[PDB]
Write a protein that binds this ligand. Structure first.
Ligand SMILES: C=C1O[C@H](O[C@H]2[C@H](O)[C@@H](O)[C@@H](O[C@H]3[C@H](O)[C@@H](O)[C@H](O)O[C@@H]3CO)O[C@@H]2CO)[C@H](O)[C@@H](O)[C@@H]1N[C@H]1C=C(C=O)C(=O)[C@H](O)[C@H]1O
Ligand SMILES: C=C1O[C@H](O[C@H]2[C@H](O)[C@@H](O)[C@@H](O[C@H]3[C@H](O)[C@@H](O)[C@H](O)O[C@@H]3CO)O[C@@H]2CO)[C@H](O)[C@@H](O)[C@@H]1N[C@H]1C=C(C=O)C(=O)[C@H](O)[C@H]1O
Ligand SMILES: C=C1O[C@H](O[C@H]2[C@H](O)[C@@H](O)[C@H](O[C@H]3[C@H](O)[C@@H](O)[C@H](O)O[C@@H]3CO)O[C@@H]2CO)[C@H](O)[C@@H](O)[C@@H]1N[C@H]1C=C(C=O)C(=O)[C@H](O)[C@H]1O
Ligand SMILES: [Ca+2]
Ligand SMILES: [Ca+2]
Ligand SMILES: [Ca+2]
Length: 404
């Protein structure tokens, strides 16, 4: 059994009294709902309020979300209830506290009295000429325009970041990682940090654009998109590696599918169309995160159909990740909990088997491990598709789950 929970949204830093402090009162509900891991925001000093422009990595007290004591307290609370903590690791780029003699912000400060992470432009990818001094290696991946991109091929860089990551585990209690903007460096580099820090899991955010048509809708065939994702996992170490990826393929298809196009939910081989259908053990599914949803809303799930999104990922192969707002703010708390309960009770895991029973525009029906049947869609009556022995146990707007 494994169910993730993103424990913050894009407005969290703003929480009166501190975000971690407020999360303490949510721990028991999260644990009781069957969550096994909670993904927490980037914990260090950041030039940006949300934490995605990290500077003094060791300076946890400067975080807008709360300080080290407050963070350790939350992680300890989660651990007391048997839930693990995943930290949002932002290492593609970094902001330097000080300017060099060129007036460029490229002299770093790790946040400790000694020289840990006190880098210079020599650690900035040479091709990021907005900040580099031309001496470093070429960036192993994509660039982040608003800040210096780090040269992960630099030995001191690899050594000091691994040192830092191990301190997050030993000093704050983090168990695992969420690799922010993993397209920014190669899978080979991600392997260095993953293999060198032994996380219970390392879920990478590898976000590639999805193929779409002239009408704006994603193509039915998204094999190229999930292929990129499995190729990343292969390169990071495959089955032996703790690394895995967010299933953006499933997110994109699902966004469009629920709009009366549920025939999109099966590929020509009879399998789920996203990463879930090719390497479920490595696919972390989700309805929305702080980027696609929340106040950023870069690619929100159709608002009136969110529970169909959860009826899908919570009963299916892959590792589902519940979004904070959906659980505590949309009034779906009991319904989501019931779905997680059905998943756990029937022993459904990331590798459970999926047998699709119906895949028409307004009706998708699937059977998992021969023990659960789920339906989503605007077509009310699918009773002729339900196998004998199955009784309904959860249901709401345009979705229903049976157990037999
Ligand atoms: C203040 C910056 O705001 C913008 O960048 C944001 C971005 O819009 C957010 O979506 C967020 O992106 C992160 C995702 O949330 C996360 O899931 C993913 O894993 O990682 C990305 C980051 O790679 O956060 C970023 C960074 O805060 C905007 O695009 C950016 O230009 C802007 N930076 C400006 C402000 C500065 C402040 O000192 C300058 O240093 C920058 O040069 C300037 O452009
Ligand atoms: C048990 C059913 O659960 C789901 O149906 C929802 C439906 O989508 C909602 O729109 C809502 O409809 C009710 C209206 O709110 C109400 O005003 C109206 O008077 O009555 C309707 C009917 O209840 O609520 C229902 C219930 O949550 C799901 O989408 C739907 O497919 C499902 N029906 C299945 C259950 C059965 C038992 O094995 C069979 O009776 C059906 O054939 C089967 O499809
Ligand atoms: C479990 C494997 O997942 C990945 O493999 C997928 C391929 O990348 C993808 O191209 C392939 O496409 C085929 C489809 O299966 C068919 O539906 C289609 O009709 O024909 C396509 C022809 O290629 O689908 C693969 C998934 O079925 C990884 O690339 C691969 O390395 C993975 N195997 C790993 C992991 C396990 C399972 O834990 C080990 O037992 C394997 O030995 C190891 O190699
Ligand atoms: Ca220092
Ligand atoms: Ca850059
Ligand atoms: Ca980069």
């Amino acid at each position: 059994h494994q169910v993730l929970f993103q424990g913050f949204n894009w407005e969290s830093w703003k929480q009166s009294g501190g975000w971690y402090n407020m999360m303490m009162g949510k721990v028991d509900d999260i644990a009781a709902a069957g969550v096994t891991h909670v993904w927490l925001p980037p914990p260090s000093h950041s030039v940006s309020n949300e934490g995605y422009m990290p500077g003094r990595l060791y300076d946890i007290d400067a975080s807008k979300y709360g300080n080290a004591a407050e963070l350790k307290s939350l992680i300890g609370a989660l651990h007391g209830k048997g839930v693990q903590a995943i930290a949002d690791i932002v290492i593609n780029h970094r902001c330097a506290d000080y300017k060099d003699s060129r007036g460029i912000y490229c002299i770093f400060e790790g946040g400790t009295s000694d020289g840990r992470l006190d880098w210079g432009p020599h650690m900035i990818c040479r091709d990021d000429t907005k900040y580099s001094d031309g001496t470093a290696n070429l960036d192993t991946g994509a660039d982040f325009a608003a800040a210096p991109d780090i040269d992960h091929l630099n030995d001191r860089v690899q050594r000091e970041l691994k040192e830092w990551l191990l301190w997050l585990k030993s000093d704050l209690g983090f168990d695992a990682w969420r690799l922010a903007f993993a397209r920014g460096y190669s899978p080979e580099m991600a392997k260095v940090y993953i293999d060198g820090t032994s996380p219970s899991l390392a879920v990478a955010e590898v976000w590639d654009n999805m193929a779409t048509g002239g009408d704006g809708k994603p193509n039915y065939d998204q094999d190229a998109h999930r292929q990129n994702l499995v190729n990343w996992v292969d390169k990071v170490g495959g089955a032996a590696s703790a690394g895995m990826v967010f299933d953006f393929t499933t997110k994109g298809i699902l966004n469009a599918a629920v709009e009366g196009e549920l025939w999109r939910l099966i590929d020509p081989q009879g399998k789920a169309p996203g990463v879930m259908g090719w390497w479920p053990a490595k696919a972390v599914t989700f309805v929305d995160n702080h980027d696609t949803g929340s106040t950023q809303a870069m690619w929100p799930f159709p608002s009136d159909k969110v529970m169909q999104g959860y009826a899908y990922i919570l009963t299916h192969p892959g590792i589902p990740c519940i979004f904070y707002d959906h659980f505590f703010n949309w009034g779906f708390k009991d319904q989501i909990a019931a779905l997680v309960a059905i998943r756990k009770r029937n022993g459904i895991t990331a590798t459970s088997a999926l047998k699709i029973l119906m895949h028409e525009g307004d009706a998708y029906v699937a059977e998992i491990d021969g023990k659960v049947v789920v339906k989503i869609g605007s077509r009310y009556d699918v009773g002729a598709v339900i196998p004998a022995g199955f009784v309904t146990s959860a249901h709401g707007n345009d979705y229903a789950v049976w157990e037999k």
